[PDB]
Design a protein around this ligand. Structure first.
Ligand SMILES: N#Cc1ccc2cc3c(=O)[nH]c(=O)nc-3n(-c3cccc(-c4nnn[nH]4)c3)c2c1
Ligand SMILES: [Mg+2]
Length: 249
């Protein structure tokens, strides 16, 4: 029993080299062939690109106002059961939590994604949204494997300020012993898409899981989208995260 997935803020609001960058992301999906893809900052022409160049993935969306999140399900592997949209009532950037209940490899899952409140100034709202996500993860039925993968925009001690991760929720990067090779997902030194002159390295993209003891645990975690495209830029200002969870008995 296993699940492989990619989480990626694909910077859809960047109108520069968007078809080439979308091609780049679809090439990654074809190469790594994940069961599920969690995407953030998707825009309408980006969906149209995914429909043609990643046609074997069912695109699940909630609200599609401006830019939004999506959960892609591999056709034939993942069976869609239901979707739930959890609002962030105090969001100023139309952010929300999207859960998609699915069946995969004989196991039941609630796959969640969000793009938590952006900007340093809205730290208090981002922390409240993280609490909502963590609360929803704990509320899922006991026999279901809960996976959150998204752009949290988290930094410093914001997780500590939220009250920390609960006793039954784990960060995949933390669980694997905080490996250095995938410690930053938003790196202005290694990534040139935004042309930020200052060197900034943050871990905005995070994976949280809630699984039964002795069942699914992270096997691997790797950065994706580190290959420069023909235009000399990367598919996004963010690196994507490729993760596999496996059962260890
Ligand atoms: N350009 C640029 C630029 C350069 C350097 C940094 C450095 C940090 C840092 O060491 N810690 C941190 O928590 N955030 C940093 N951001 C950041 C990243 C996203 C958003 C906002 C932000 N939004 N609104 N105001 N600031 C700041 C940067 C951004
Ligand atoms: Mg962006």
């Amino acid at each position: 029993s296993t699940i492989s997935f990619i989480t990626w803020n694909i910077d859809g609001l960047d109108g520069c080299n968007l078809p080439e960058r979308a091609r780049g992301v679809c090439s990654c999906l074809a190469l790594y062939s994940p069961d599920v893809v969690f995407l953030q900052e998707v825009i309408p022409p980006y969906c149209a690109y995914l429909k043609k160049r990643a046609a074997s993935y069912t695109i699940i969306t909630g609200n599609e106002e401006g830019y939004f999140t999506a959960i892609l399900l591999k056709k034939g592997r993942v069976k869609f059961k239901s979707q739930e949209i959890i609002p962030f009532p105090n969001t100023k950037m139309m952010r929300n939590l999207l859960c998609v209940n699915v069946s995969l490899g004989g196991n039941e899952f609630c796959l969640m994604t969000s793009h938590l409140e952006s900007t340093r100034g809205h730290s208090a709202e981002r922390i409240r949204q993280l609490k909502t996500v963590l609360g929803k993860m704990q509320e899922a039925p006991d026999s279901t494997t809960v996976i959150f993968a998204g752009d949290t925009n988290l930094r410093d001690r914001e997780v500590i300020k939220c009250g920390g991760l609960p006793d039954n929720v784990f960060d995949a990067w933390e669980f694997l012993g905080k490996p250095k090779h995938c410690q930053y997902t938003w790196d202005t030194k290694a990534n040139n898409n935004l042309r930020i002159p200052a060197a900034c390295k943050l871990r905005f993209d995070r994976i949280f899981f809630r699984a039964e003891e002795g069942h699914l645990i992270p096997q691997s975690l790797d950065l994706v989208g580190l290959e420069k495209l023909d235009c000399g830029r990367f598919p996004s200002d963010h690196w994507g995260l490729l993760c596999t969870l496996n059962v260890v008995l």
